[PDB]
Structure formats: structure tokens, C-alpha cells
Design a binder for this molecule. Sequence first.
Ligand SMILES: Nc1nc2c(ncn2[C@@H]2O[C@H](COP(=O)(O)OP(=O)(O)OP(O)(O)=S)[C@@H](O)[C@H]2O)c(=O)[nH]1
Ligand SMILES: Nc1nc2c(ncn2[C@@H]2O[C@H](COP(=O)(O)OP(=O)(O)OP(O)(O)=S)[C@@H](O)[C@H]2O)c(=O)[nH]1
Ligand SMILES: Nc1nc2c(ncn2[C@@H]2O[C@H](COP(=O)(O)OP(=O)(O)O)[C@@H](O)[C@H]2O)c(=O)[nH]1
Ligand SMILES: [Mg+2]
Ligand SMILES: [Mg+2]
Ligand SMILES: [Mg+2]
Lengths: 414, 392, 392, 391, 72, 42, 71, 71, 71
Amino acid sequence: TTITLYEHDEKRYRDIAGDKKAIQDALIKLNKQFKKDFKKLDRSEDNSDTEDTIDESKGVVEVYANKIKARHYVGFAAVDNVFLQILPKVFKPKEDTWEPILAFIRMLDMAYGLKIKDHDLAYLQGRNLRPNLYEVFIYLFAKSLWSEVQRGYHREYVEVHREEKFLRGKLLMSRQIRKLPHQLNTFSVEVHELIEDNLLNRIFYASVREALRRTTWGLNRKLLGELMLAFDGITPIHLRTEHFERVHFTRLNERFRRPFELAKLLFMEVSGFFVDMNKLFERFIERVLVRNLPPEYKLFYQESYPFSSQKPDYVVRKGNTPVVVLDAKYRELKERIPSSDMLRQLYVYSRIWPAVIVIPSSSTYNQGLPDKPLEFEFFDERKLFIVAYNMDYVKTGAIFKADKNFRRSLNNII
Amino acid sequence: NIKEDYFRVDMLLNKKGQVILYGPPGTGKTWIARKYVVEETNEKTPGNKWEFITFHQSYSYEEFIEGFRPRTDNEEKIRYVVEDGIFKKIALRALVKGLFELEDATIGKDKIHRLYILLTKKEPLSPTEYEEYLRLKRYLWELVGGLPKDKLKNLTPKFYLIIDEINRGNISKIFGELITLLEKDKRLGGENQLIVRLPYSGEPFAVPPNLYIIGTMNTADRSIALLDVALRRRFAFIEVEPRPEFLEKENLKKIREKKLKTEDRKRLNEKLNELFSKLGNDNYFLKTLLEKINVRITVVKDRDHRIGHSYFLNVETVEDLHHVWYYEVLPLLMEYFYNDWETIKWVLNEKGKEHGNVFFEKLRLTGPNGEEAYQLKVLEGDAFIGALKRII
Amino acid sequence: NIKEDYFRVDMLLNKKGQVILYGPPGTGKTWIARKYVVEETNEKTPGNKWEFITFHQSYSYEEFIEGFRPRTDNEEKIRYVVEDGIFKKIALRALVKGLFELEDATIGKDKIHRLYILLTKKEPLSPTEYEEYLRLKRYLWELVGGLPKDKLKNLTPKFYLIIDEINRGNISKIFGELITLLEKDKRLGGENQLIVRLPYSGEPFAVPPNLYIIGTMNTADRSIALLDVALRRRFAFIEVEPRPEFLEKENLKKIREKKLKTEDRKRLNEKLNELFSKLGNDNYFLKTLLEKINVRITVVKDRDHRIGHSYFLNVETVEDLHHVWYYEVLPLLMEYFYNDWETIKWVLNEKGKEHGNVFFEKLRLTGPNGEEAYQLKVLEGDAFIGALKRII
Amino acid sequence: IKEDYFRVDMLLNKKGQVILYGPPGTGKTWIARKYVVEETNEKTPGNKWEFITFHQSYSYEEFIEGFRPRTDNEEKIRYVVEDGIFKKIALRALVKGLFELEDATIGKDKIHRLYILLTKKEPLSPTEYEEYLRLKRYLWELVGGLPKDKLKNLTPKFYLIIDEINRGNISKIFGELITLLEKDKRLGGENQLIVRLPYSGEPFAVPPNLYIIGTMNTADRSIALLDVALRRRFAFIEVEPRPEFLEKENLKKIREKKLKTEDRKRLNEKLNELFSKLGNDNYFLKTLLEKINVRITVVKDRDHRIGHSYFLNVETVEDLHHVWYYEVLPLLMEYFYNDWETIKWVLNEKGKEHGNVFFEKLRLTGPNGEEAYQLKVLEGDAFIGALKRII
Amino acid sequence: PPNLYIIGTMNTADRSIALLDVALRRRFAFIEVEPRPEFLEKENLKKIREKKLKTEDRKRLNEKLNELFSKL
Amino acid sequence: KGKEHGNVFFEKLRLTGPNGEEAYQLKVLEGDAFIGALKRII
Amino acid sequence: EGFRPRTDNEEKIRYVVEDGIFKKIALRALVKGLFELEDATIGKDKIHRLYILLTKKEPLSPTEYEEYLRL
Amino acid sequence: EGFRPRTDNEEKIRYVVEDGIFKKIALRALVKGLFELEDATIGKDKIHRLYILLTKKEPLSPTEYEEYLRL
Amino acid sequence: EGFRPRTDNEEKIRYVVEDGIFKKIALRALVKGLFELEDATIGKDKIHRLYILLTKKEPLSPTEYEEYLRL
Ligand SMILES: Nc1nc2c(ncn2[C@@H]2O[C@H](COP(=O)(O)OP(=O)(O)OP(O)(O)=S)[C@@H](O)[C@H]2O)c(=O)[nH]1
Ligand SMILES: Nc1nc2c(ncn2[C@@H]2O[C@H](COP(=O)(O)OP(=O)(O)OP(O)(O)=S)[C@@H](O)[C@H]2O)c(=O)[nH]1
Ligand SMILES: Nc1nc2c(ncn2[C@@H]2O[C@H](COP(=O)(O)OP(=O)(O)O)[C@@H](O)[C@H]2O)c(=O)[nH]1
Ligand SMILES: [Mg+2]
Ligand SMILES: [Mg+2]
Ligand SMILES: [Mg+2]
């Protein structure tokens, strides 16, 4: 069964496909698996409460008696033929669930640091496939591999001190001089032969073999079927985490960086990955600000310690003199005013940095939308200047029209 | 319609110089290449005018052109004389056999005929005549460089070389000196005559315009990720399609009677009439079965993974069709789809069927995470024919 | 011929010392390396003035400049001697031929002539004269140590080493010592005369300024491409783009009658007039056909996987264009886009077409999970030109 | 000028063996060849210094010692162990250092007999090779009975200037030398090591004369000296690609160093004609290499920078055109193979698509919305206007 | 010669039949020797062990197998 | 980590990459300014 | 088929080509099959000499090995 | 087993087949097994001679190596 | 321990077995160990003859290696 969630959204167990007992068995393994692998991913003002909440089967999904509720952890996971995918709530609409997939991967393209191509994703737009995050990241792995295997096969050179019936390469002399004449019929050479089954090819044969076994599309089954035939002579391996560390990216296999990072993102039971929606917006806004703020340079994660260090998500300073704090919040900001938890942190970030502070918030049809300019000016009775900026999201499309509107509102703010 | 396939090879082999009969296995690519050379140069065996040679994964350049090899010398201790491979024993042979018919006033025809004897010698070279072989080979490449390009295009004996399974070996490593030479222009006598200096023996070497290197590439193994520049431009690729037109009643009768004898063709007529009467009196059954199963292969997987037509070409009864479907089609079908079951039953259009007359029946015990494993099921008699009559 | 690709090789090889003609397959890279050296040295065969070798993955460092190679003597069969490769037999040949017209070798001009005989000797070196060869070699590097740099700047011959497919071998390993000699001011006579010490023989070695190295690498493959940044400085890369301008009506008559200067110029001209008259009297058809494929390959594939102008150069008739399409470049296009059918339909500009006069017909049978693949169609006649007029 | 010369001379007395590492295209082999020539007054290799260079087939058996068949009699091929390139230097640098000592090494007839059999270019006959192998056993019986004060100060400085030290498998080539390449583990040091060789079994120790100045490139990161125990031995001199030499005056000072005022007047008016076409600015090629090396530092790494061996041999604007389109733009395209919006940014033509751009945009597009550019060969003064926009 | 038949034997716990070399899945013809549990009955285990032993060993083999399956 | 200019071994290059990357360069110091860049480690 | 060393009456090592397993069973299947052929009776004495030599073990001297290579 | 040179005559260095450890221990187990067997009494006075040659803790002498070969 | 060819002045290549670094320390520690005590190590001149033939700087002659193998 395929189940899909948006951030802070619920599904009924009666309407859902499959079995009632089957889905709740899949989740308790996933929330437990998120507990052991929680510390690998960074957060930003998450209020995670690592001791109590995550180990109570509330790590990724809150499984309840009457419904199934998603926390603010975005991504996907495939467990026990119950494929779960959690999209952001910002891309929620009012092919009907194919626009938020390419919106989320493009927000996973710019924020998280991936180097995927837009024409890789635009190939899938309109082919009426079943929307699934695991079916597209296997495709993004398989297409970027088959576009990097079609040119060259990555045959890397190792040297072997082999006793050959012929003579290839440099003849070892200290091993041939001390050769008895009863065994003179084989040369003892040290040939730098190119092997096809290197460590990077043992991984990509194993990463395809664990992908074709767990794929469900009709496009990925054809593409991984051609990749497995190209890797036919390679002896297979069992994938571990030691194999993904033992290879290093030099200049002769640098073009295999794009399929390998996606092969490390999906393989290392469980499959997939999860990230916090607060930090992914904190990373995504950081791409927008430094591009859109020419007058003043901006650094993310600068920290100033009170008295326990409370650090802003981003601060922009021209040289050192202007202190314009920019704290990225994923909150909906209901009733056109910041909440108690938000404005209390905005007060501290301005005071310990005469410092204006701007809060960027999400804006679409689903999320709360303010007017086009800088919506809310606030003073906290200390000559402060709190500006509520809102970035519109044309990221569901491929054109960046809202970046010009975000620059025009920031130019009036700067 | 096989003389056009002996003309499709023949029109490309005088224009590009060498071909590759690429196609799915069980088609006749080895048989078309072998029965074209035997029909052209009337020599039923290898050796003199053509040499059959297959490739493998551990085949190296030193076995093909030349390499240092230990060789015994008159039942005594070994020496380390450099041995010419299987190509250089026929590339030099195609030169010195063509240089008989050339009437020039500089040919050492007594010396060239002595070199031709030492090249066709089936025994290995003894050191009393190996130095006579290397000295006469030195006279050959002093003579070839002195002949003009006008007298090195019309060499009469067409030498051949059936490279079987050319994609199985590493093609760019075997053809070391033969991905700069195997063009029609880079041969001897052409406009771009190149005599390439070899690394091991140190003597210059150039392919003559007689040698045509026919290749028979299986493409269900070590697929189309080829060299794509060197081993793809030189070879004029001929697709040998798996033709189900040879699987009718008359076409199976015509194939198995021409190679047959007097008493064999009457028994092959009685056997094939018994076979197709058990199938439903369908004279076009095995054609329609192979054509239907080939369309399902080219839709799901690649178009060059189709089941060929050399398998069903040697059937005479239902029991022989059973032993070619369960040992040369269904193990071959489970090889292409990498032990998949939900798409291997759509090829037989048995996607929504289980536990009946199906070639892959579901086991009635699912796994822990809801997975299911199918199992091959042997059939017999009219149950198997009813399992074949719903593939169409 | 002398306009661009000759006058920019000769200017750049005389300035840098080494030229690599990198470019996609089907372009005149081996040809412009062969034509430039033969038109310079006036020797249409290898040997004395120039040597044409080619690299591969079985090529050794020990067989290039210096290595231990076991020879076959008479009474001691296994005798391990150090044998100079092909580069040390062309670098020492370029040195002792250039040192015939010097004025500081006045004690051993007979010794330099005797050393030149031992290097031009194609017979294998007997061990009674190999020590005479080694005594003259260590006399040579004593003589260039006492030679001034003003007299080693101008050596009047011009020796060449056309290595072909340089990028195939392990170029960091084959050029062992040559990764620090191959520069214009690091040969003999340059501003930094470097005489390095070879490992095996223990004799010093330095590339003369007489020598030039014209590599022709291929850049369609990527796992063998030359990314050694310390080696790309030594060479001087010349991109030979595949020019479709050699496929016009006036250009095919000028390229094919320059080489074939026989009395068949009336035969080629009336055949090339008949070929373009069947193409709609379009004198720029094959120029437009190769241009509208190479641009459409550049945008989706890499820019170095383009179709060259050596496929469509040897066309004569529509029957010959049909043979070079369906058997050389259409299996090549199915190798670039291997079961990526929406791309290969678009490269031939048949994206919306799925029936009729088209190369790839759509199958009328879709798959289980919504996949769909196409099928070749062997066209002929004016319908084939109607499938080529849609590309341009 | 003499700063890189003196910096090599300081570290070759402190650590013992210097390594000039840097991006390819700078003066690494040149400042290593000019150092050894100006310090030993010997322009060709020989006794006082020997140039070698490493590769993957430069194994241990031919560098220090290994078995080598050698008979010099055309009969009775004697399978004897012969010393490599290094041990023929370190034994030569020792027995040349045992001349100037007064009375510590009492071998004044037996050391000079060993030196004349070590510098002998003709290969050793077996009637004198038994003398060479017997005197070498006397040498390591002599060394060991000398005080460290009469062994630390050996006068004549020997140099084994090697090249591409990273290119060979350096932990395999350096065998017994992996523990002897410190300044205090040599002969005469505080902790001398008479280490034993495997094959011949005769002991061995490096003299304090022999300095190993070894140049390497660090753009190939596939083969860089990442062994952390062969970075303690060597002293790593940074040789960055310095664009200060590509001025008008600094290019006139370098290129007119050895011409004897014959072609120097031709070179002076040729550089006057080059910079008159670049815009009458003496500082063009300095900031051209600077704005490329900075823009290639922030993208690829610090180590893939364009050197100054490319642009140093330009004379006219035509020779700059033939070093741009044929040496560095094919180099810039193979850093970024089919990575087009990056290589457009190194030339900072990122908004420029058509016109005087090196990479014009193809008028076609893709089926999935992709695009790719095409290299545009520019000529004339339009090439300089396409080049001055980089600065 | 056409006499020489090549009867292979393949322990496929480590290497599957799809993981062979490509000139082994087409030149040869594969027979799956399935693990038959029907050789482990009470009467089938007696008949298999009756071929190797003698007559007096068979009554001891009969009594031991009767002692085995009574405990199970 | 916060020092990007002045007495520091690695100055920051003034422009960033096209997609948010930024590299440094090894600044050679001398004298007491080197010690002032060394005593801030401890 | 391969190379294998062999002593010649306590002398230096003499290399000789000794057939492996597959060639010793393929040649044995040939010379045993030619007994019951009516056309191969032109050399029935010499073929039978080969079959006795091909089933015995350790050919000790070259006088029967050169007989073996002649047959 | 493999080939080793021996201390034969001066100009007559010979390559014999000196047995290793596994052949020597399996022969020694076979010789000691047949030494106490009842039906192998045809040459039991020579099997004890072969046992002394196999427990000989030194390289075998060339004047009696053929006695080891014949036994 | 390994094999090593050794042609001295005019003899043939007699393939001697040369002890490596470790056995020339292990035998040298054992022989210098037994040289100081006297419980049952008879032949103190014989043990001293083995110690001289272990600290030889020159390679061993075949008239001296054979007595070194016996000791
Ligand atoms: N006359 C003439 N012929 C040309 C020209 N360019 C290519 N050709 C022809 O192309 C043919 C082969 O081109 P070639 O140079 O050999 O490709 P290549 O460099 O070897 O291709 P690769 O596989 O190594 S990558 C030759 O027959 C030659 O006649 C040209 O500019 N003029
Ligand atoms: N006068 C002068 N010439 C220089 C200087 N730097 C480089 N050159 C010149 O540039 C040329 C190339 O420099 P070179 O030393 O050979 O580069 P490299 O470091 O050795 O190149 P690599 O492949 O080993 S990494 C030399 O001929 C040298 O004359 C310099 O600072 N002063
Ligand atoms: N008579 C006849 N037999 C054919 C034809 N095509 C194939 N065969 C048969 O196919 C068999 C050879 O198959 P082969 O070429 O080895 O298949 P492949 O090499 O794996 O592609 C032979 O036994 C032929 O009898 C044909 O056109 N006519
Ligand atoms: Mg075949
Ligand atoms: Mg070529
Ligand atoms: Mg260098």
C-alpha cells in the first residue's frame, strides 16, 4: 500500500488502503529506526525532546488509535510494502499529486546541496506515472548513473604482481632471477591492468541490485535492468557503511559523484531518509538571501551566547556595522501576528546583536498569505523594527518570478 | 530468403571492410557468418583461407596480435621467442598469399613462397626455422613499403576471420593496433596506408585489403555500452533480427529437408504433421507464438533481448517443444528479467492468474513483510498446449 | 588542405613540440596527422623519418622507452637483457641523425655513424654487437654533455612520432620519464637542458629537439579521457570539430577527386550529380543533415559524442546512403540513446510522428506499468528521402 | 628572485629533503634545476647530481637495489644484485665525503679506489666487481668506527633531484629509505641508523651530503603524498602560480635573460606591439591570470589553478590566441566536462549568451528543456574585447 | 567428439545461475536438483539405509529408527 | 572560524561561487604579526 | 594442455607439453569410438596402440612419448 | 612435492623430486599402516626399510636416494 | 628463508638457499645463547664454528656453506 502525508496532516484508518494492522506494524519499526539514526541530521529550533518523544513511537509519525498524524519531518520511507512519503504542507493543493513532488525535490535541490538537473525532473512531468518519492530518487540515481556509464565505464587501474603465462607490463626482476628452472615457464610480472570491478563498481552493482528488487515503476525497471546488464561481470557485494567510506573522489572518478551521493542517500530493513522541515526552509532561504542581498554579505549560523547559546538562523552585516537579524521560521503565522514563542526569540536575537530583525515565512495557496509588500512592522517598546517578510513560492514551477518580488521587498527593507 | 542476408553482408564487406552481426542469441549470427564464408571461399574447415576464433573475458592482446610466450625448442629447455597471435598469423598470411598473384619486377616469389609455408605450418615453429621465419618476415615489410598503392588494392584471395562473440572480450584492448588499421582506408594499398610499428616484436605491421573480420556479437550479454568510437565506426553493424517467419509448417519443413536425406524428409513430414495437429491444426502456430512473445520482450525490456529462432527450429513433436520451452526459453526468460515474476507473467499474459495452468504459480505462504515468491511449474500433455494457446 | 588544419598544426607543433588532435570519431584526426607528416618528411611509409605507433591498454612502459625484455640467445635461452622501446629508438635516432652536421663531435663522427647504423638496423641486435651499441650509447650522452646549447637548437632533420589513440594507454605510466621532458624548453638545446637518468639501463636520456609527437586521442569515451593536468600542459590540444562543410556538392567533388586523380573523374561527377538530383537538387543537403544531427546531439548528449564527417564522406548513391544510414549511424544512434526512445525520435525530428514514413514505428501494444517502446522500419526508395527531408 | 632560491637552501639544511609542491604550470622543476646548477656549478647530470623522475613502473628493485643479470663476457650470465639509482648516489656521496677527513677514516687508498669504481661509466667487469663488493664491505666496517663529529660535516653537497615524487608509488619505491630521510637519522646525526637491506644483505645508511629536492604536482589528487609519515620527512615548499611574472616589465626581464642583445631588440618591439593591442596597459596578463586563478580557486580547488608557464612564452597577440584556444581553454573544458553554467562563470560571461562570447548559445533547445553551448573561435580585436571582459 | 558429455555440478548457495559467465548459461543446460524431503519418511529412510548395511545391521537399523520416531 | 581577514593564515577570497561556494588562500605572515596569529590559537 | 617440467635420467629440467584432463578424455573418446567404425579400419592397429597409451599412467620415457605424438 | 637441486657430483648437479611434508606424512602413515598388516606380508622386511627413510630427519643422501625411489 | 642463485667465479648457477634477515638473527641468538653455557652442548668449538659462519660479511663459499648446513 502507498500512503502519503503532508506536514501536520492526518489520515483515517477506515478510508486507508490495505489492512489496519499492517500500517501500524510498519510505523513502529520506522519510528524506532528514526530513534537510532536521529543524531545524524541537524536541526534548527526543532524542540525535538530527544529523550522522551522520539522513543515513544512519535519520532516521524504519530500513530494513534483512530488516525495517523505526521510530525514536521519531511521526506519519505519504505517499510514492509507500506511506502510512506511526507511532503511539506506549503506545497499542498486546494497528476493531482504530481506538482508537490517536483516542488519538494527542487526545494531539496537548492537547500540540501544536491546537484541534480532540471531536465531530469522535467522528463517525468506529464507521463502519468504514480507519484512516489522512492520511485523518483531511484530514477534520479539510475538516470544519472546510466548517463555517466554510457560515456565511460570507470575502469580504474590497480597493479597486481601476477604470474602470467604471457608477458604484460613491467617484468619483476627480483622475482624472476630467483625463479628455479623447473618453474621458468611462467613470467612473473607486475602489470598495471585496468579492472572493471573496482570498489565504485561493486557499490553500483549492489546499489542497483537493491534498487531493482524494491522498485515499482515501469520506467525504473527498464533503466535498472540495463544498468544491471552493463555490470554483469562484477562480483556482487553486501552493502555496508564501510564500503561507502572506503572510496575517495579523485579526478578520474569525479563524474561519478552525482550517482554515488544519491546511492549513499538511499542505501547503507528501512530505506530512504528524513530531514527536518524547519532546517530545510532555513537552508532554502539562505540560498535566496545571499543571491538577493548584494549590498550586505550574509552568514548563516552566526552565534552570540547569552548569559546556553541562542543563535539566529541567519544574520546579514555589511562589514560589521549593520545588525539585521533574519530568523527563518516554518510557522504559519496565523492572524497576521507572530506567536508567543516566535516574538520572544525575535526580541533576544535583536538585543544581543539598535538592530532590526526580519522573519521570513512561507506563502502559497495552502499557507497563510499576507499582502505583497512587507506586511507587518512591529516595535517592541525599545525602538525595535520587526518586519514580517513573506516569500512567495513559484518553486512548484521552474521559473523564479517571486525572487524578483522578494528582492523588491528586501530593497525597501534594506 | 537467406541469399539477401548473404548479399547484405557481401555489400557491406566490400564497402566498410568488416561487419558485426549483432543480434539476440539463438538467431543464426554464428551460422550466417560461417555459411557465408564457406559459400564464398569453398573451404569447409578453418586454417588456410579463414580462421574461426571466439572471444572470452580473459582473452588478451598477446594471444591476438603478438606477445612474449615461453616455447619449447626441440624437446629441451624453454626459450622466450615472441609468438604471433591468431590475427597476425592470418594478416601476414593474407598478405603473402595475395602477393603470389601480383606480377611485379621486385617480388621475391621464391622468398614469399617460403614465408607462406612457414605461416601455414600447423606445427609450432622450431628455432632452426623460426629465425628463417623472422628474417623472411623482415623481407616482407621491406618489400611492402616499396610497392606502390596501385599494386596493393587488387589482391585476389579474400581472407576471412569469424570473430565469434566480439563483445564478450574487451574490444578496445584486443584490437590494440586494429582500431587505427581496420578501416578500409587504413589498410594496405588504400589512400591512407599505415604500417604500424608493434611494441613486442618491434617489426612493422599493417592489415592487407584481403582480410575481412566478420563479427558475431551477442547482445543479451555485455550490452550496447560499447567503445562507441573506435570499435563502432570501423564495424558496419548488421542487425540479424530473430525471424519467426522460419517457424511455420512449410518453413520448418523446408529447413529440415534440404539438410536431410531421402528417408529423413518423409519422417520429418510425418513428425511435423503430428506436432501441428496436436496444437490445434494451426500451421502458423510457432510463428504466432514467437512473434507474440517477442513483442512483449521489446516493450518491457530492450528490443535486443528477444528470444531467437534457433531454439524452435529443431522440434518434431510436442515433447521436444516441451524440452525447448523449459530449458532454452524459460531459463533464458528468467535470466533477462532478473528473477522477476510480476513482469515475467505479463510476457505470457498470465498476470492475473495463479495456481492453474500457469508457468509461474504463486506459493501459498507469503513472507514476513508481505512479499510473495513464485515458482516455476512443469506441465505436460494438453495442459501445456492449453498453457501455450493463451500466450497468443 | 593547407588552409586551416595543416597550417595550425605546423605552427603549433613547431612552437609547443607536441600536438594532440582531440575530437569526436569520424573527423580527420588520424588523417590530418598522417597527411601532415608525409607532406613534410616526403616519406609515405614509416621507418627512417617517422614512426606510426598506436597506444592500447596492453601497452607497457617497458616496451615504450626502456624495460627488461627476455631475449633468445643460442646457448643460453633465457637471457634477460634491457631493450630500448620505440621512443628510445626514435629519440636516439633523431639525435644521431641530427648530429651529423655538428662541429664538436670531430673525434667520433665515425662513432655517430656507427651508432646510427645500429639504430636503423631492423635485424635483432646480436650480443656481440649489443655491447658495441651500449658503448656507443654511453659515448653519445658524454658528447652532448660537452655540446653547447647554442649548437643543439637547430638540428636539420625533423623526426615525428605519430602516436594514435594516445588516451587509450596509461599515459602517466607510458610517459614515465617523458612527463618532464616533453616541453620545448626542456628538450636538448632548450633553455633548461634536462638529461634524466633512466631506471633499468642506468644510462642518461634526453629527448632531442628534432622529435615531435602528434597524438590523436579520442574524446567520445570518457573513462579513457586525458584529465592529467600536469600532462595537458606538455601537449597543445587542437579541437578538430566534425565539419559538415565537407559534405556539400562542390566539396564532395573536390575531396574525392583530389585523392583519386585517375580518369574516373567523369564517373564520380555524373554519379554525384545523380545523387543530389535525387535529393531534390539540394547542393547543401548532406551539409544540413550532419549539421542538424550534430546540433541535436550536442544539446542532449555531450558535445564530444557528435557524428563525424567520415560516415557520409564515402557516399555515392541513394543506395549507398541507405547502406551508410541503416548500418553505420542508425545503430550508432541506438547506441547513444539505448532504449531512450523519446530522445532518439527527437534527434531525427520525428517527435510527434509515430506512423508512416518514419524510421521508428510505434508498437500498438503498451506495457503493464504504462511503458511503451518503438520498433525500427527499414525504409527504401523515395520514402527514405521523405524520412530524411524531415530532419533538415 | 633569490627568495625561492634561498628558501630551498634553508630547508635543505633543516629538514634535509625539500618538496616543491604546487599547481602545474609554475616554476617547480625550473627552480629545482636552477638551484642545483647554481650550487654545484655542473650544468649536466653526472657525479655531483643526478636527475631522475618517478612513475608507476619505477619500482624498488631499480631505485635502491635489486637483482640484475650482468656478465660483461657474452657468457656465464651472473645473477648478481646491483645497486639502484639511489644507492649508487648515497655510496658515492659517502666516499666523496671521506676524502677531506684528516685521520678519522683511515682508508685513503681504499676509499679513492671505491670512488673510481663508483663513478666509472663503463659497466663493471667481474674481476673488478669483486673488488667493488669487497671495498663496500670495508666501507660499512669503516663507517661505525668513526666519531659523529667527523661524520656530520662532510663537505661536497650531493643532490638527487627527483621529479613527480607523487606519481610513483612513493611508499614502495622508498624501501629502507622510509626511516632514513630525517636530518638526524643519517650518518653523523644524533641517532644514526646503519639499516640492513633485504636483497644483498649489506648494511646501508644515507650520508649527510645527499639532499633530495623532489618536485610534484598536486592537481591530480588521485596520486598526492597523503602518507602522513612521508610528510614528516620532507619540507613542503608552496610554489603557487605567481602572475607577477606576466607584467610588461617582468616579462621583459625574464624573456630577455639569455639573448646577448641580438634578438632582444626584436623581442622588445614585439612586446611593445603586444601590449599596444591589449589597451596600452602594462598589467594585462597579470590580472588575467589573477582573475582566472581566483575564479578557479572558489570553484574547483586551490590546486587546479592555471600556472604561468602557459602565458610566459607569448610574443604577439597571435601567440596569445594560440595559447588561449589550444592550451588553457581545452584545459578549462576538461575541468568542467559538460558542466556549462560553471565554465561560463570562470570567464564571467554568465549573462552573456551570444555575440563576443567564447561559448555561444545554440539556437536549439531540448525535449526535456535542456540546452548546451558551442565553442566560438574568435579572431582579431574582437578576441581581446572578449578577453578584457574577464578582468 | 560427440561422445564426451559434460555433466556439471553446481553448488548455487553462493553463486546463482544468473551470476555465471555468459558462455555457460547457453552452452550448457540446467537441471535443478531440488531438495526432496520425501527421502526422510519412516519407510524411505529404512530403504535408503538398507542398501549400505548387512542383514544383521538392518534389524539394529530397524530398532534404532523405531526408537527415533517414537521419541518424536 | 569567525576571523576572515587580518592576522589570519587563511584570508577569504572576496567573491563566492555561482552556487554558494567560497574558498580561501594561505596567507604568508612574518614577524610579530605571525605570533599574533599564532597566540590566538591558544 | 600446458607446460610441465620433466627430468631426463637425473639431468637438467626438460620442459615437455603434457595434456590436461579435458584433452585426455576427448582424445580418449575419439580413439575408443574409432574401433567400431568400418571406415577407420585402415589404421585399426595404430589407433588401438593410442588407446592403450592414453589410458595408462605416467609415460616414463620420451621413446613412447614421441610415439604418442606421432600417433 | 617439487624440484630441488642436490649435492651430487661437481659438474653433475641434478634436479630430483624432493617430497614435501604432506606427501611425507601420508606415506609415513601408509608405511606404518602396512607394517602391522597381516595380508601385506609379501615384502614386510622392505616396508620397515621404507619407514626408516621416512623418519630420517635430514636431507636424503644421493647414493641411497634411488633406494628411496625404488622402495 | 628463500631461494637464491649464486655463481661465484666460474661455476654453474647452483641454486643455494639463502637465509633471510630473521634466520640470521634467530640462529645467531641461539648459537650465542648456547656458547655461554655447558650442560649438554658438546662441541663448543663446533658451536663456535657455526657462529663464525653466521657473522660472515662475505657470502659463503660452497666448500664452507655445506659445512654450515651440516652444523
Ligand atoms: N580528404 C579528406 N578526407 C577526410 C577529411 N576528414 C576526414 N577524412 C576521411 O575520413 C576517414 C577516416 O577519418 P579518421 O581521421 O581516420 O578518423 P579517426 O580520427 O581515426 O577517428 P577515431 O576512431 O580515431 S576517433 C579517412 O578516410 C579520411 O579520408 C578531410 O578533411 N579531407
Ligand atoms: N625565468 C623564469 N621562468 C619560469 C618561472 N616559472 C616557470 N618558468 C618557466 O616555465 C617553464 C615551465 O616550468 P616547469 O618548471 O617546467 O613547470 P613544472 O612545475 O615542472 O610542470 P610539472 O608538470 O612538472 S608540474 C620552464 O621552462 C621555466 O623556464 C620563473 O619563475 N622564472
Ligand atoms: N537451415 C537453417 N538453419 C538455421 C538458420 N538460422 C539458424 N539456424 C540454426 O541455428 C543454429 C545455430 O545457432 P547459433 O548461430 O549458434 O545461435 P547464436 O550464435 O547463439 O546466435 C544451427 O543449428 C542452425 O541449424 C537458417 O536460416 N537456416
Ligand atoms: Mg554465437
Ligand atoms: Mg585514429
Ligand atoms: Mg616537473
